[PDB]
Design a protein around this ligand. Structure first.
Ligand SMILES: [Ca+2]
Length: 215
């Protein structure tokens, strides 16, 4: 795998979004991994719909939280997911309003990275494209992150509670990192991104619940 990769450079990542007060980070992480594959498979970059997932993944809990593997299973079983324009984000749970006419992507299933394997996570981002990841984002240092390579020893790999997307990895000033896209708006972190330490004992549990969709 290459020493570093940055999908933002390849045009594989859509602009950073803002989930608002809904616990829909899982839907944004899932659509980001799907938009990454959609760009690789069609050459077009376009926003997928987080709202479609929030109201349609009955296996999940709306604004009450959920998992990306559950979202990829819904897209596969449903034979599609709508584009954000066809199904706009409103930030609150509503009845399922999926419309096949607005279908913008399909999924044929998914794959999860070996648990805690930072090496296998690296091989996947490099081989597949952006990958959905779960992290413990409960620390004040994470919430107020601004720059550099994030690392807080108090982060708990066993307390996963937020979903984000790995769009690459590299090194900055000698510190290996994962390039993470959040869905807290462009004003959060560095233009809505955070570089998280890579190979530092799976900091924040970044390789514990990683997955990507098959397309
Ligand atoms: Ca499931």
């Amino acid at each position: 795998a290459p020493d570093s990769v940055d999908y933002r450079k390849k045009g594989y990542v859509t602009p950073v979004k803002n989930q608002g007060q809904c616990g829909s980070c899982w839907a944004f992480s899932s659509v980001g991994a799907l938009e990454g594959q959609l760009k690789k498979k069609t050459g077009k970059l376009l926003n997928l719909s987080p709202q479609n997932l929030v109201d349609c993944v009955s296996e999940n809990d709306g604004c009450g939280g959920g998992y990306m593997t559950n979202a990829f299973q819904y897209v596969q079983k449903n034979r599609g997911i709508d584009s954000e324009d066809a199904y706009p984000y409103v930030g609150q749970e509503e009845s399922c309003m999926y419309n096949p006419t607005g279908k913008a992507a399909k999924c044929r299933g998914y794959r999860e990275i070996p648990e805690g394997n930072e090496k296998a996570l690296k091989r996947a981002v490099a081989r597949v494209g952006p990958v959905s990841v779960a992290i413990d984002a409960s620390l004040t240092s994470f919430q107020f992150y601004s720059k550099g390579v994030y690392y807080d020893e108090s982060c708990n790999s066993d307390n996963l509670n937020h979903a984000v997307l790995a769009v690459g990895y590299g090194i900055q000033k000698g510190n290996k990192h994962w390039i993470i896209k959040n869905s807290w708006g462009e004003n959060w972190g560095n233009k809505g991104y955070i570089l998280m330490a890579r190979n530092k004992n799976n900091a924040c549990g970044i390789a514990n619940l990683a997955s990507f969709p098959k397309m």
